[PDB]
From a paper:
Type III secretion systems (T3SS) are bacterial macromolecular machines that facilitate transport of protein substrates across the bacterial cell envelope. Most building blocks of the virulence associated T3SS or injectisome have a homologue in flagella and one of the most highly conserved parts of the system is a set of transmembrane proteins known collectively as the export apparatus (EA). The FlhA/SctV cytoplasmic domain is known to form a nonameric ring underneath FliPQR-FlhB/SctRSTU, but the full-length FlhA/SctV complex remains poorly characterised. Open and closed states have been described, with the open state being competent for chaperone-substrate complex binding, while the closed state has been proposed to be responsible for binding early substrates.
Out of the identified proteins we chose FlhA from the lateral flagella of Vibrio parahaemolyticus (Vp-FlhA) and SctV from Yersinia enterocolitica (Ye-SctV) for further studies, as both could be produced in large quantities at high purity using the gentle detergent LMNG. Particle classification revealed that Ye-SctV had formed a dimer of nonamers and we imposed D9 symmetry for 3D refinement, resulting in a 3.7 Å reconstruction of the cytoplasmic domain double nonamer. The Ye-SctV cytoplasmic domain 18-mer is made up of two nonamers dimerising via the cytoplasm facing side of the cytoplasmic domain. This assembly is not consistent with the known localisation of SctV in the injectisome and is therefore considered to be an artefact of the removing the complex from the constraint of the membrane. No high-resolution features of the transmembrane domain could be discerned. A striking feature of both structures is the N-terminal density of the cytoplasmic domain, formed by FlhAL/SctVL, which reaches out to bind to the adjacent protomer, demonstrating this well studied interaction for the first time in the context of the full-length protein in both flagellar and injectisome T3SS. In both of our structures a hydrophobic residue, Trp350 in Vp-FlhA and Phe367 in Ye-SctV, sticks into a hydrophobic groove on the neighbouring subunit. Comparison of our structures with FlhA from S. Typhimurium, St-FlhA, in the open state and Sf-SctV, which is in the closed state shows that both of our complexes are in the open state, with Ye-SctV being the first example of an SctV homologue in the open state. The demonstration of the open state opens up the possibility that SctV binds to substrate-chaperone complexes in an analogous manner to that described for FlhA, in which chaperones bind between Sub-Domain(SD)4 and SD2 and are sterically unable to access the binding site in the closed state. While molecular dynamics simulations suggested that E. coli SctV does not easily switch between open and closed state, our SctV and the C. pneumoniae SctV structure show that SctV can exist in the open state.
Residue numbers in the entry:
A (entry chain D), B (entry chain E): 361 to 704
Amino acid sequence: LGEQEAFAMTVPLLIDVDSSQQEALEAIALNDELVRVRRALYLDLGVPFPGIHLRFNEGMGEGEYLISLQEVPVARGELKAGYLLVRESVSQLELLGIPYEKGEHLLPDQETFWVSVEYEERLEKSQLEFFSHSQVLTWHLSHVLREYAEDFIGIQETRYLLEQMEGGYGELIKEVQRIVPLQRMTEILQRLVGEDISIRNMRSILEAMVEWGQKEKDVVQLTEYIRSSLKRYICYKYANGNNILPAYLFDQEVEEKIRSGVRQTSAGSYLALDPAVTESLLEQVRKTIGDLSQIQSKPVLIVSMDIRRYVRKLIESEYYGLPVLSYQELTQQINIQPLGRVCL
Amino acid sequence: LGEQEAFAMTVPLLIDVDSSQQEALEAIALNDELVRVRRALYLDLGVPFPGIHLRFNEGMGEGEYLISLQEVPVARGELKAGYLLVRESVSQLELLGIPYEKGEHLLPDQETFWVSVEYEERLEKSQLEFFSHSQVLTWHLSHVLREYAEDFIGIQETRYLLEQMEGGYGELIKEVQRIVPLQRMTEILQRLVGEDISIRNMRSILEAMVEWGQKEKDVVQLTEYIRSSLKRYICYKYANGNNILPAYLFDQEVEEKIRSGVRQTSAGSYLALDPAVTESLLEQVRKTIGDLSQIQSKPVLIVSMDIRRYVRKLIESEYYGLPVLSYQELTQQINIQPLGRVCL
């Protein structure tokens, strides 16, 4: 036992589902239904995701499954599709109009109710959302990555991109590395994928990295200049229609209250107004935006560039699916259709 | 005798149990029951523990055993299971309701009373905690490491991690070594494992090492920023339930008395208020927290980040099993359920 300790590396991503399916589930693909949603999610965000280890554990129950990032279960579940109970995401009284018996739960994103596989034939005629045992699993996965993609872009992973691109763009990389150190360039790539912006376009992120890495030095400013280099991308991510975008402009009185609380002190530049002012603004927002749960068409808040960040991490608690843009990121020839200006 | 001195290295960890078992104990494993609890404890903390030498000494009695860190017995014991008296940890009047004769002691952590091996058959029916001759030994071991894990992470042991990780994360390490010297990076890894935080996740400790090792320079601040990188880990170590955490918030009046006594002088930043104020605060704590011996569910104190340390080493005498958190380490989506605010 005198062997010293034999260090063992932690696993980057891990899926632990129960036993009793290690050969029973195992048959849609569950080795080509993960690698499919990992690639299909890579081409969306661009993060070089890690290898998903798949372990069928017997220690848990029979419908349990936990998805552990680095040995801390981040989205566990007891799939009561355990035997076969293919769930329903947009479950409603329509599943009472389509009367097949239900099973209650609040599986995360939409109201989940479960029906059996004889009931499936008739409800698939009725056309609602069906999640097989693959699609119930990967969905949380494709939701775990999209929300924890700030943790897979580390100094070891960008140096993977800046090596994989050596062939294509030689003199671009040998120029960017001398201007922005790897720590600083990575502290940006995390800040893009935080707003669900896609790294994928890795060239025009380095063009705008070289251009501004000499003039600007505060990361939060530099990333607002770099988003402004993906102009005609964002116009396509948020406003899919004919150059019309449903916005929620901030009336100038507020964009000035926030620009006066930046506190550029210790490379944090924290927005520090007051625990009593934050609730004042966050109320004026909640008073106009409402809840946006019924509000369709995915609106976006639109605020000046230099505070586009601090507004984002402010309402990040209440309004999570409300992206924030800038005036600059808005490529011209976009018809902002203001839903309602946020007064004070 | 002219041989100069022939230097002989001290042993890192050493178990000295008596003779008369060197072949009699020797049969559960006692070479695979230590290496099992050493590995099982490594995957918990992450420290690369040393090799446990096992020596059966005759110089002692017949039920004695001492566990010596570097030749100073740190947890000795005369196991009065000497012949066979498998102990009981949660001994109570239930062992008078289950009337089998007892043997009194205060073996450390829970009330230890001993019963024989014919009594074992019936009390194992009654379902209380049994410690065989292995489990009485390793338990102190798995308690010695967990409490002296600040002594196994030295500059020689982190350079073992930063070499074992060269393969996986090359450019991460070649970046962190130039930012934080080995002394400074190790003075952190000791400060994590001091709070029972787990080094194990060695990547996101280096990501947050690179990020903050340039801005912050006081170790105690840097480690409070590094704990804030293991956010969604701590949420799982202290609040296992559904995002609900039983806290003991500090009312703001106190968190300001302590922030005024930091004395950042000689890289010690000692909290120096008064031997008469420390008893004032430590009384207001003891007046609300009580004793927490009956208080179940493992509550945690929750104080602002910048003094999370000085509060910890303050109550470290009285309330040892009361972990202290920050507001920052608390990942959002955690329902702090304040048990009672510590007023002044």
